[PDB]
Amino acid sequence: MASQTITVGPWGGPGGNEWDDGSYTGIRIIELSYKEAIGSFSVIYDLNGEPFSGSKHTSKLPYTNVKIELQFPEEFLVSVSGYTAPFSSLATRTPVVRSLKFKTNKGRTFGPYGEEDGTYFNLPIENGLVVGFKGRTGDLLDAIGVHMAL
Amino acid sequence: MASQTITVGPWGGPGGNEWDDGSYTGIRIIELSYKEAIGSFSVIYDLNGEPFSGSKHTSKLPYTNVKIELQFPEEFLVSVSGYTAPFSSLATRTPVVRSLKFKTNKGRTFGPYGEEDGTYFNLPIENGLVVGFKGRTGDLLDAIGVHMAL
Amino acid sequence: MASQTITVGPWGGPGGNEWDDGSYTGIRIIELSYKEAIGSFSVIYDLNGEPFSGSKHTSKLPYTNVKIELQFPEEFLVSVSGYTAPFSSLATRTPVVRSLKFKTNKGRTFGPYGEEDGTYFNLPIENGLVVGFKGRTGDLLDAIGVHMAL
Amino acid sequence: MASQTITVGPWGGPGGNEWDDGSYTGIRIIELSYKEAIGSFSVIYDLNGEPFSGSKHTSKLPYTNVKIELQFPEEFLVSVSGYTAPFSSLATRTPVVRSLKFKTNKGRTFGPYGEEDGTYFNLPIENGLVVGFKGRTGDLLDAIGVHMAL
Incomplete structure (x- = not known):
């Protein structure tokens, strides 16, 4: 009943718990953690020309934290890619x-x-533009997907 | 370069301080003041399921204040209407x-x-849906416009 | 259901027969007739860089024809306006x-x-852009509305 | 300057000649040819409730033709997937x-x-909805991408 965006994905599996940051006006910063898989994932959005921090989807695993700072608004994502697979450290496939x-x-x-x-x-x-992320997180990132707008 | 919505209007005159709340996912509350004209105008938007207070566009005039509380998300605006005209007690009319x-x-x-x-x-x-307001305010609401999405 | 657009209007009365041209990529030509009111109203749309003729909504009345050829794609509409009222030679107001x-x-x-x-x-x-018209036609144009996109 | 949709892909290689069907309001039929690779590709779109013929992107190779007829409008695509690779029958990698x-x-x-x-x-x-295809076709289908709308 409220406003909606085109949404594609998810890529990944059905484990963890779903989260959805919803949609905004663009992307300023992406933060994530990684080792053998992706752990934490969080974003600072643009909301009508000011930063807006998404909720944190944190992994407690001892991973490396990274920060991707885009030169917003002139610089934006044109590709999201990756790999999905079972991980042998988890209790299931x-x-x-x-x-x-x-x-x-x-x-x-x-x-x-x-x-x-x-x-x-x-x-x-x-x-088009990525305007939002959604995904699934348990101990780590089970799945990821994108909201898009013009 | 950032994400955009359809914007119609404004309706009203050219004076006053320009403002633009930008775009969100819906409308929860509208607060305005009035007497001979409309004075203040501010909105509590929905942003991805949580309230987000827009900037206040307050008139310094002592007017009657009113709060419009919509049963969001099931209830939403289908019509915005009103009247525009010179305000004779300003020099600029x-x-x-x-x-x-x-x-x-x-x-x-x-x-x-x-x-x-x-x-x-x-x-x-x-x-479609109203997802944001813009306008101009001096002593009074000189003009108002609307952002739409869906 | 199928793809949708923001739709506003119509302005006018509930007489005549309803029509909806649906949505396209832009507006190339507006063809109308007039005297004391608007008679005929038909549009040549852009569809993906080629013209597409909308259904004709013609009036049999001996009115003056107008053909408005926009400099598509660089020139597009920023305002649609007009007047509505009863017309004395109809059976109802x-x-x-x-x-x-x-x-x-x-x-x-x-x-x-x-x-x-x-x-x-x-x-x-x-x-935004006007990307389609809808309306109502009997002997005259009873009502007019617009579809909008970015 | 004209109306626009979100466009994702293409998936495939840079060879062949670029084509773009543009965007419409939905998909009625997809017809393609196949054997060890995809040869022909063309679509009957929905355009405001009526069928619209896309341009044919046909291959001369002796492949099997197949017609995908969807129960439009109630039935629509929720996934497009496939495989892309060099093909040893071609004089390029x-x-x-x-x-x-x-x-x-x-x-x-x-x-x-x-x-x-x-x-x-x-x-x-x-x-969201697939509302159009674009791609590259030489002797066969080098690449395929999709237009999306709400």
């Missing part, structure tokens, strides 16, 4: 996000973070 | 928003607030 | 579109066509 | 579309068609 990689319209590449093991996924954007 | 009235999908009418003098305007929304 | 006027981003005004009698309506477009 | 598969909101799957060799791609759609 549920597929999780093993790797993530981002590319921008200014020709910068961020990543790959994690391990490129399993099934590649790739979302090239020819026209 | 500039047109301002003299009256506003709001109708909802649930058949509730809020208003008219102010005086029904001058040029009537009406935005009947058959499909 | 049902309101019809007495006048129309169109303005473009290049500064061109087309109109008024018809007679500026009754209640003024005005749709200023600050951001 | 450029990747091409080796296989395609479609799924609908009514639980039907069409495909896989062609050969599942190389790099999998997958566009799951949680919210």
Whole structure:
């Protein structure tokens, strides 16, 4: 009944708990953690020209934390890609996000973070903007998906 | 370069301080002041299921204050209408928003607030949602416009 | 259901037969007739860089024909306005579109066509495009509305 | 300057000649040819409730033709997936579309068609509609991408 955006994904598995940051006006900063898989994931959005911090989707695992700072508004994502697969450290074979990689319209590449093991996924954007993330997190990132707008 | 919505209007005159709340996912509360014209105007938006207070656009004039509380998300605006006309007691005789009235999908009418003098305007929304307001305010609400999505 | 657009209006009365051209990529030509009111109203749309003729909504009345050819794609509408009121030679006081006027981003005004009698309506477009018309036609244009997209 | 949709992909290689059907209001029929790779690809779109013929992107190769007829409007795509890879029958190592598969909101799957060799791609759609295709076609289908709307 409230406003909606085109949403694609998720890529990954059905474990963890779903979260959805919803939609905003663009992306300023992406933060994540990684080792053999992706752990934490959080975003600072643009909301009508000011930063807005999304909720944190934190992993307690001892991973490396990274920060991707885009030159907003002139720089934005044109590609989200990665790999999904079971991870043998978990108690089950549920597929999780093993790797993530981002590319921008200014020709910068961020990543790959994690391990490129399993099934590649790739979302090239020819026209339009990522405006929001949604996903699934348990101990780590089980799945990821994107809201898009013009 | 950032995400955009359809913007219609403004209705009213050219004077006053320009403002633009930008766009959100819906409307929870509208607060305005009125007497001979509309004075203050501010909104508590929905942003992805949580309230978000927009900036206040307060008139310094001692007017009657009113709070319009919609049963969000099931109830939302289907019509924005009112009247614009010069406000004779300013030197510039500039047109301002003299009256506003709001109708909802649930058949509730809020208003008219102010005086029904001058040029009537009406935005009947058959499909889509109001997701943001913009305008101009000096001593009074000089003009108001609307962002739409869906 | 199928793809949708923001839809506003209609302005006018509930007489005549309803029609909806649906949505396209833009507006290339507006064809109308007029005298004391608007008679015929039909549109040549853009569809993906080629013209597409909307259904004809023609009046049999011996009115003056107008053909408005926009400089598509660089020139597009920024305002649709007009007047609605009853028309004395009908069996009921049902309101019809007495006048129309169109303005473009290049500064061109087309109109008024018809007679500026009754209640003024005005749709200023600050951001977005008209991508389709809907309306009601009997012997005259009883009502007119618009589909909008970014 | 004209109206626009979110465009994702293409998936495939840089060879062949660029084509773009543009956008419409939904999909009625997809017809393609296949054997070890995808040859022909063309679509009957919905445009405001009536069928619209897309341009044919046909291959001369002796492949099997198949017609995917959806129960439009109640049935629509919720996934487009396939495989892209070099093809040893060609005089270039450029990747091409080796296989395609479609799924609908009514639980039907069409495909896989062609050969599942190389790099999998997958566009799951949680919210929104495919409203158009674009791609590259030489002797066969080098690449495929999609236009989306709400």
